[PDB]
Amino acid sequence: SFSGYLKLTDNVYIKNADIVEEAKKVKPTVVVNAANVYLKHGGGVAGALNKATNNAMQVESDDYIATNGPLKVGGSCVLSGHNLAKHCLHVVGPNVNKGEDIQLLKSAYENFNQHEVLLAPLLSAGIFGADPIHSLRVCVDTVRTNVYLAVFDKNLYDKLVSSF
């Protein structure tokens, strides 16, 4: 199970960790990917998770898009977790750097409520351009299931904990 996490609330936990290394260690039931609507896992968390699967996540994702079309911003899909987890929940948070409505971040986090426990990054943080402090606030106020947040950056992790 999950180790070294700081408990923020009854159901939200946080750790300064690389989500790829965390996933390879825990092999959780669900790892969340910070996906885009096209499931093009180029950079950030998505690029890192996909690289850890030796591109198997991208091959599976391209077949999913060919069949279903793009996801909605705020939406998700469950695909294989490959060598990282049983499943990967690909969740699309709004990308502020594309002018997407930050109000969609709550809808994005609501996808986590369909899973009893998840290993996840902060949605819309990093290259998605949102304020990670705001993302953590929306996470705590939206997710009711057990979410283990992995924050890659130590300095951001310390800021998130100290300002919580």
Gap between the Cα atoms of 123 and 92, Å rounded: 8
* Side chain identity at residue 95, one-letter code: N
| Distance, C-alpha 141 to centroid of its chain | 16
Query: If we measure between CA atoms, which residue out of 4, 12, 33 comes closest to residue 141?
Result: 12
Query: If we measure between CA atoms, which residue out of 70, 88, 92 comes closest to residue 79?
Result: 88
Query: If we measure between CA atoms, which residue out of 126, 97, 98, 120 comes closest to residue 108?
Result: 120
State whether the Cα torsion 147-148-154-158 is positive or negative.
positive
For residue 72, the 8-state DSSP code is: P
Cβ neighbour number for residue 20 with a 10 Å cutoff: 19
Residue 83 contacts residue 53 (beta carbons within 8 Å): yes
Q: Which distant-in-sequence residues (6+ apart) come within 8 Å of 16 by Cβ?
A: 151, 152, 153, 154, 157, 158
Q: Which distant-in-sequence residues (6+ apart) come within 8 Å of 72 by Cβ?
A: 37, 92
Cβ neighbour number for residue 101 with a 10 Å cutoff: 11
Domain that holds residue 145: 1-164
Q: Name residue 77's beta-bridge partners.
A: 90
Structural domains of the chain, count: 1
Pairing mode of beta strands 30-34, 76-80 = unpaired
Resolution in A: 1.1
Q: Environment class of residue 25 by beta-carbon count within 10 Å: exposed (0-12), middle (13-18) or buried (19+)?
A: middle
